[PDB]
Amino acid sequence: DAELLVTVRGGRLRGIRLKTPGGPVSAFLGIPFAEPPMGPRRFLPPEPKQPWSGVVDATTFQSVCYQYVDTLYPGFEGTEMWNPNRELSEDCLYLNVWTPYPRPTSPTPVLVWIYGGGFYSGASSLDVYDGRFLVQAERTVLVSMNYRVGAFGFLALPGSREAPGNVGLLDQRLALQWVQENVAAFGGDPTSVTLFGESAGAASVGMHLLSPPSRGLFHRAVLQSGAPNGPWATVGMGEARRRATQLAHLVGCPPNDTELVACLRTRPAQVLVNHEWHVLPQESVFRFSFVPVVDGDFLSDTPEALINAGDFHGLQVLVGVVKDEGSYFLVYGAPGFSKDNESLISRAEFLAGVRVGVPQVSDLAAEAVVLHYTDWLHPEDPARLREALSDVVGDHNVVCPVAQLAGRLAAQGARVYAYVFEHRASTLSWPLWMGVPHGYEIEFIFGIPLDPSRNYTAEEKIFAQRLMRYWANFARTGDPNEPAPQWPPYTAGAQQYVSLDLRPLEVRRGLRAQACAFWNRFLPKLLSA
Amino acid sequence: EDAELLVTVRGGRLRGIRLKTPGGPVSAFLGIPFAEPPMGPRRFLPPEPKQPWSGVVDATTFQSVCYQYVDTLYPGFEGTEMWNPNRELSEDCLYLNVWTPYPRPTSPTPVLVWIYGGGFYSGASSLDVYDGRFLVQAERTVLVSMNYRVGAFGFLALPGSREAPGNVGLLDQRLALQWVQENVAAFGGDPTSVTLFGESAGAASVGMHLLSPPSRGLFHRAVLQSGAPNGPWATVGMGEARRRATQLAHLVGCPPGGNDTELVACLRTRPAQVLVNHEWHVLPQESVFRFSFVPVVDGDFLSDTPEALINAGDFHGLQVLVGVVKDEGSYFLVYGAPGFSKDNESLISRAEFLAGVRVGVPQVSDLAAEAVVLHYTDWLHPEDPARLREALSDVVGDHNVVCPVAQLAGRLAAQGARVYAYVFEHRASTLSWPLWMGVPHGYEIEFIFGIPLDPSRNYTAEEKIFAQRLMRYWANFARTGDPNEPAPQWPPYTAGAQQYVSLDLRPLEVRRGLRAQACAFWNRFLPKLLSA
Numbered sequence A: 001d002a003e004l005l006v007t008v009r010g011g012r013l014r015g016i017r018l019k020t021p022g023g024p025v026s027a028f029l030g031i032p033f034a035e036p037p038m039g040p041r042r043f044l045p046p047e048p049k050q051p052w053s054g055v056v057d058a059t060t061f062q063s064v065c066y067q068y069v070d071t072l073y074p075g076f077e078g079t080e081m082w083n084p085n086r087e088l089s090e091d092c093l094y095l096n097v098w099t100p101y102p103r104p105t106s107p108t109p110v111l112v113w114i115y116g117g118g119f120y121s122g123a124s125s126l127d128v129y130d131g132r133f134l135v136q137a138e139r140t141v142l143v144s145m146n147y148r149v150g151a152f153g154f155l156a157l158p159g160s161r162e163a164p165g166n167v168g169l170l171d172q173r174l175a176l177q178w179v180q181e182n183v184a185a186f187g188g189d190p191t192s193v194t195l196f197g198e199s200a201g202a203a204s205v206g207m208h209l210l211s212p213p214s215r216g217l218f219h220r221a222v223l224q225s226g227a228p229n230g231p232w233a234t235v236g237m238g239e240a241r242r243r244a245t246q247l248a249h250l251v252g253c254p255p256n257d258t259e260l261v262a263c264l265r266t267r268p269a270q271v272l273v274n275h276e277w278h279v280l281p282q283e284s285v286f287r288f289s290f291v292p293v294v295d296g297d298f299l300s301d302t303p304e305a306l307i308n309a310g311d312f313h314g315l316q317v318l319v320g321v322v323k324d325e326g327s328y329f330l331v332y333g334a335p336g337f338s339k340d341n342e343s344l345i346s347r348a349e350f351l352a353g354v355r356v357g358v359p360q361v362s363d364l365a366a367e368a369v370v371l372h373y374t375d376w377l378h379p380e381d382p383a384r385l386r387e388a389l390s391d392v393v394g395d396h397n398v399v400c401p402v403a404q405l406a407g408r409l410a411a412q413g414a415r416v417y418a419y420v421f422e423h424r425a426s427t428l429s430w431p432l433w434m435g436v437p438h439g440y441e442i443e444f445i446f447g448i449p450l451d452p453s454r455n456y457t458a459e460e461k462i463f464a465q466r467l468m469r470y471w472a473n474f475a476r477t478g479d480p481n482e483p484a485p486q487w488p489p490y491t492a493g494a495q496q497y498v499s500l501d502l503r504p505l506e507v508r509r510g511l512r513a514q515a516c517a518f519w520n521r522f523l524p525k526l527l528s529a
Numbered sequence B: 001e002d003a004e005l006l007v008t009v010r011g012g013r014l015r016g017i018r019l020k021t022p023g024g025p026v027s028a029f030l031g032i033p034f035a036e037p038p039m040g041p042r043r044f045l046p047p048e049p050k051q052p053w054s055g056v057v058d059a060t061t062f063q064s065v066c067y068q069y070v071d072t073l074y075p076g077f078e079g080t081e082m083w084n085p086n087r088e089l090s091e092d093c094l095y096l097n098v099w100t101p102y103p104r105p106t107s108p109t110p111v112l113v114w115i116y117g118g119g120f121y122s123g124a125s126s127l128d129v130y131d132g133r134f135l136v137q138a139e140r141t142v143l144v145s146m147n148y149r150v151g152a153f154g155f156l157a158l159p160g161s162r163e164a165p166g167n168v169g170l171l172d173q174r175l176a177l178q179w180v181q182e183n184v185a186a187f188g189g190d191p192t193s194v195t196l197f198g199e200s201a202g203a204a205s206v207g208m209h210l211l212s213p214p215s216r217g218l219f220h221r222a223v224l225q226s227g228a229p230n231g232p233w234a235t236v237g238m239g240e241a242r243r244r245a246t247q248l249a250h251l252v253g254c255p256p257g258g259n260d261t262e263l264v265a266c267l268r269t270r271p272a273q274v275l276v277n278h279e280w281h282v283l284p285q286e287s288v289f290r291f292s293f294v295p296v297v298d299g300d301f302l303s304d305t306p307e308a309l310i311n312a313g314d315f316h317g318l319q320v321l322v323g324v325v326k327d328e329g330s331y332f333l334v335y336g337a338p339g340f341s342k343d344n345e346s347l348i349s350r351a352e353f354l355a356g357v358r359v360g361v362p363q364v365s366d367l368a369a370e371a372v373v374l375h376y377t378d379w380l381h382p383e384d385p386a387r388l389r390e391a392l393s394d395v396v397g398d399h400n401v402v403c404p405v406a407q408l409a410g411r412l413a414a415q416g417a418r419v420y421a422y423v424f425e426h427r428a429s430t431l432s433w434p435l436w437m438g439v440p441h442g443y444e445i446e447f448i449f450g451i452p453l454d455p456s457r458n459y460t461a462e463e464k465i466f467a468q469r470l471m472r473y474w475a476n477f478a479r480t481g482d483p484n485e486p487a488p489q490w491p492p493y494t495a496g497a498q499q500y501v502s503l504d505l506r507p508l509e510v511r512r513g514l515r516a517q518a519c520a521f522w523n524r525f526l527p528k529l530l531s532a
């Protein structure tokens, strides 16, 4: 079958044909785009894959980059759907390509997916990132890569040449460079690449927006439940060096940078994973040890500084959030919370949870949060405290950082479309008090409901095809609308967004404008003084 | 001679007048001297009791208003002239008034003692709106009201000095209450059921008597209307009080600081009007709701600041009734806030809103000012002129009245005091102020005193029935410590439930929270900001 045979620049590839309820697609899985960053190349920037002879087996997903594996609810589908479904290895820099069957003979718009996972986990092989449905239903080319996470991707000894940091981000950029030189061989159009990602993936997208070497490798961005400007996606040079130095102490290696990292390179990958989470300064939720570092190279400044100073005329972006972004993170450290529970916390637990949810800030800053999120007519209602604390970590970490990004880019040339995903899947295993948790719009954007092997309803499948068309319309034209209630662009003044559920589109104003004026306008003034 | 118009108190004999009311006769003793005139060498000094006199003193009309400033902003306007002096100005002005039923009560009768407001720089017991004939006539009580020194004459302080110890306007009130305990029984009043009640600076004064032990033994209940002792305007530290007194002396010509006795003595040689003409040039900033000479926290009258006394006080066996009106901040904005006027709709721009915030909250850091802007901005309509207008009035009202009143009420309730709270939501048919001002500060007073029953006035019918209902509310609290009639009930205010009633033409409506969200900011968070 000649359709499964592609010659990229490194050599020849053999793909596989896959079935969907709407017809077949061509897939090429486990395409090597970098030399394996092992041994002496641990922590170093990625190197392009040297050419090979013969035919590369591109019929199965490759290995998952070494990462922590969640153990909180063993066997629970809500946690295991994000866990690795392939074996772990540092040899993990492969990407996957999905195109229609037979492969297009005309340039096709390309979508590049960057997975999330707090920069410590994730894999392009997860079932919920299956690109076969989007490609068949909307006739695009979908690409997805694996980038290093945790210490292997983002341990930085700033100023070092052996651990410069952000190497997980250059992994993504190298894949985007691979796209520009090779996607046309699959029928893709390298002059219409649309980045999209969720959570840390969405944050990774925005950082490519603000890094000029990456800007020439794609044309639009979709940021779902993530942003580069939040309080969790970046770290300073000094804190990055402290965390890298402590991890080395915890693994028995002596805190000279080059001998330090040389000793780290002698440690099995598993032992570094086992200690990465204990270099955090304080017991926290939504805080991660090894994230991108602001060191003047990849980002010449902090994301907020580059957002405020940038000219964004000629750029379209699609941004949004789920209804209850905070719900999911509080079962991982917030006092009194559990998924097998109503989690009707007390005031003591609420205030205790505020220091966990808003870590590393002064007492005054913490009390300011409590005042804004307390109903002083119902100061101790457990149901209200449960939802207020979810709003705290949800607004602080996702809703407000994204609302700021949307407002600034719109006011500075970019055309922005904003959504909030308000449908709770019928297959959701999480309790009802969590509502629509973080990350559970992805399965609908990838058309997972169309899989007849699953228990989604008829309306949900129609809903999935609605959002696939929205996303694909944006990739094709920079406008999600169908040329029906129209989706208006978000602006700093009107602050208009739409709600995505089984009902038709509903236009609303303000992404929690009151609560995010607190985080985006007042709090920064409070800490600097 | 009419025997009911002749009363013997300790100072000597008095003669009063017979007042005709719509409901019947009332005996009034207006202009009773209770202190020696604080003139010349006695200026700035504590009041001395009135020396006994021979013969009969004609206590038959209101005496002079204590020297004070006269408002000239809207000349001839009824809304401003009703607060201006209606008698001659003079430093000889320490006189009180007594209204009693005709004939005098057979048995002891509860006593209401009124303390007027005016930002501690103005006011007088003779204002038509404080006429006590209808209250005494309708509810058969004894109403006492006194004058006290305002402005620099009442509250200029050089702390530690003996020549100008400060707070002398408060001891004027205290001596008047001491007069009530010794002489009100001669009019038929009960010295062991005396209920203080005042409005604005009067209410702040009433509260400071709660927290100073020498005053607390002279009354039994309290009514605080649109004022509290803990507001950011009713007291001043010892140092700023000395700075204002010293520069007032400088601006008038004394000395040509130094020695207190020497400096005060030179101030005594200056005409009273000259002091009044300069007392507002000492305020540190352009402001509204700030007053140059107010009670000073010196450790004497108030051993500590009112907030700390309220928090450290045991108030068991004590009943107070507190409240505010619906739109408290509107009156003060036409006196300095940019873009405001009673003759316009005062639909300010956002630039004038932010400028108005600095006037409404003076002497605070830039961080605190922006914290105010955050909580009072509607970030979905940040520049709507109408919303900005009511936002600024909410800023002024909450910061200076509503929240101060709310914290006092909550701390008293939690520490053993039965509290009742209200919000006055009726806009009088005769109101001269524009519509955008709502129910302004100080306009519940005329309904409390029964003024609508005056036949010369053109109040509606229903407002008269309203006035009778509130007069009954106020009198029931005076007699029994509970405003309820022995109809829907008025529940006590507690720190948890925070229940209060609406006062208007419809029946009582129970509600929760006196701007709880807004005032949690003023009472709980903002005090933590200025510290750090």
Ligand SMILES: *[C@@H]1O[C@H](CO[C@@H]2O[C@@H](C)[C@@H](O)[C@@H](O)[C@@H]2O)[C@@H](O[C@@H]2O[C@H](CO)[C@@H](O)[C@H](O)[C@H]2NC(C)=O)[C@H](O)[C@H]1NC(C)=O
Pocket: A333, A334, A335, A336, A337, A338, A340, A341, A342, A343, A344
């Ligand atoms: C909700 O449960 C939480 C979590 O407790 C775990 O999950 C429960 C289903 C049950 O199996 C518990 O035994 C588990 O430990 C409770 O929060 C815990 O409460 C226990 C005491 O009951 C305490 O010892 C733990 O420290 C708490 N853990 C945390 C993270 O706060 C909570 O009490 C339950 N809430 C209810 C029942 O309303």
Ligand SMILES: *[C@@H]1O[C@H](CO[C@@H]2O[C@@H](C)[C@@H](O)[C@@H](O)[C@@H]2O)[C@@H](O[C@@H]2O[C@H](CO)[C@@H](O)[C@H](O)[C@H]2NC(C)=O)[C@H](O)[C@H]1NC(C)=O
Pocket: B259, B260, B261, B262
């Ligand atoms: C502050 O001044 C008073 C007044 O001083 C008197 O009059 C002045 C014009 C000056 O010329 C002084 O010499 C006079 O004594 C002082 O109070 C007087 O103090 C003296 C001496 O202690 C005493 O004999 C008088 O009785 C006092 N007269 C009063 C109280 O009216 C006071 O001591 C001065 N304070 C200082 C200088 O710190």
Ligand SMILES: *[C@@H]1O[C@H](CO[C@@H]2O[C@@H](C)[C@@H](O)[C@@H](O)[C@@H]2O)[C@@H](O[C@@H]2O[C@H](CO)[C@@H](O)[C@H](O)[C@H]2NC(C)=O)[C@H](O)[C@H]1NC(C)=O
Pocket: B336, B337, B338, B339, B340, B341, B343, B344, B345, B346, B347
């Ligand atoms: C509304 O009124 C204020 C008050 O101004 C005065 O009263 C008006 C009724 C009218 O008679 C004006 O001519 C008076 O000056 C206005 O604010 C003033 O505007 C003038 C004109 O530029 C300015 O010189 C003053 O400084 C302003 N005063 C303050 C306190 O800001 C206001 O412009 C009037 N109109 C509107 C639409 O707001």
Ligand SMILES: NC(=O)c1cc[n+](COC[n+]2ccccc2/C=N/O)cc1
Pocket: A068, A070, A118, A120, A276, A277, A278, A284, A285, A286, A287, A288, A289, A290, A328, A329, A332
């Ligand atoms: N070093 C790390 O960043 C890290 C963070 C969290 N975990 C474990 O995952 C907990 N968790 C798992 C899934 C979703 C949220 C969370 C809570 N994070 O604070 C391991 C390593």
Ligand SMILES: NC(=O)c1cc[n+](COC[n+]2ccccc2/C=N/O)cc1
Pocket: B068, B069, B070, B071, B121, B122, B151, B276, B277, B278, B279, B280, B281, B289, B331, B332, B335
């Ligand atoms: N003694 C003074 O010079 C003086 C000057 C200004 N004020 C303030 O008056 C303006 N004002 C401001 C707010 C409310 C009322 C009023 C008018 N009261 O008569 C008081 C005293």
Ligand SMILES: *[C@@H]1O[C@H](CO)[C@@H](O)[C@H](O)[C@H]1NC(C)=O
Pocket: A454, A455
């Ligand atoms: C969901 O699908 C599974 C397939 O493994 C099936 O066993 C289960 O019965 C389904 N649930 C419902 C409610 O149909």
Ligand SMILES: *[P@](=O)(/N=C(\C)N(CC)CC)OC
Pocket: B083, B116, B117, B118, B119, B120, B199, B200, B201, B202, B331, B441, B442
């Ligand atoms: P309060 O003393 N009362 C005022 C200004 N007033 C005039 C309307 C009522 C007497 O203000 C602080």
